[PDB]
Design a protein around this ligand. Structure first.
Ligand SMILES: Nc1ncnc2c1ncn2[C@@H]1O[C@H](COP(=O)(O)OP(=O)(O)O)[C@@H](O)[C@H]1O
Lengths: 65, 55, 48
């Protein structure tokens, strides 16, 4: 929660840096992704199929987003 | 919720591999009447099975 | 969910590597304790 322009993306960028190093336990080293809601509507029903395929690989692999 | 299902067919039906998984998530459509074809045809070739309705 | 995520990465991964270089030989014991950091580590015997 913050003003539109405080650095919301940088919060997740710093957490991924500690995973590569070694300051994160192996039980918490999860893959960080950027769920883009606009990428699902690429090109000129279909939205329900692309949304389920993305929200499925993260559950079977246990990773944050 | 997973070990209780695997032990159900491995003890009563004497076969842990007779367990189907129906992930109720992608079937949320309007044409799921004459298509689910999938669950009826699977239990026809094997009357001794366990049907799981995940989510 | 963190069950298989921690065992297969901090208990089964380190033990599988010692079975190749010569860490755990078929005939000894596998000591599993907690290090000073607070994770699951396997006390190896011989070296590489
Ligand atoms: N403490 C910080 N150190 C380095 N970069 C930062 C820090 N805080 C914010 N930023 C930068 O600010 C940007 C914020 O981007 P974002 O939150 O996506 O949109 P907006 O620029 O509108 O806030 C990030 O790309 C990040 O690189």
């Amino acid at each position: 929660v913050g003003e539109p322009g405080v650095g919301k993306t940088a919060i997740a960028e710093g957490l991924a840096n500690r995973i590569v190093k070694g300051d994160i336990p192996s039980s918490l080293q999860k893959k960080v992704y950027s769920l883009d809601i606009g990428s699902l509507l690429a090109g000129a029903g279909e939205f329900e199929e692309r949304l389920k395929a993305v929200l499925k690989e993260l559950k079977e692999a246990q990773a944050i987003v | 919720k997973t070990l209780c299902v695997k032990e159900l067919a491995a003890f009563l039906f004497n076969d842990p591999g007779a367990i189907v998984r129906i992930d109720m998530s992608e079937y949320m459509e309007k044409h799921a009447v004459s298509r689910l074809g999938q669950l009826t045809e699977a239990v026809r070739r094997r009357p001794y099975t366990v049907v799981l309705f995940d989510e | 969910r963190p069950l298989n995520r921690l065992i297969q990465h901090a208990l089964l991964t380190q033990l599988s590597r010692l079975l190749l270089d010569g860490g755990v030989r078929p005939g000894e014991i596998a000591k599993v304790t907690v290090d000073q950091e607070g994770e699951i580590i396997v006390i190896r015997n011989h070296g590489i």
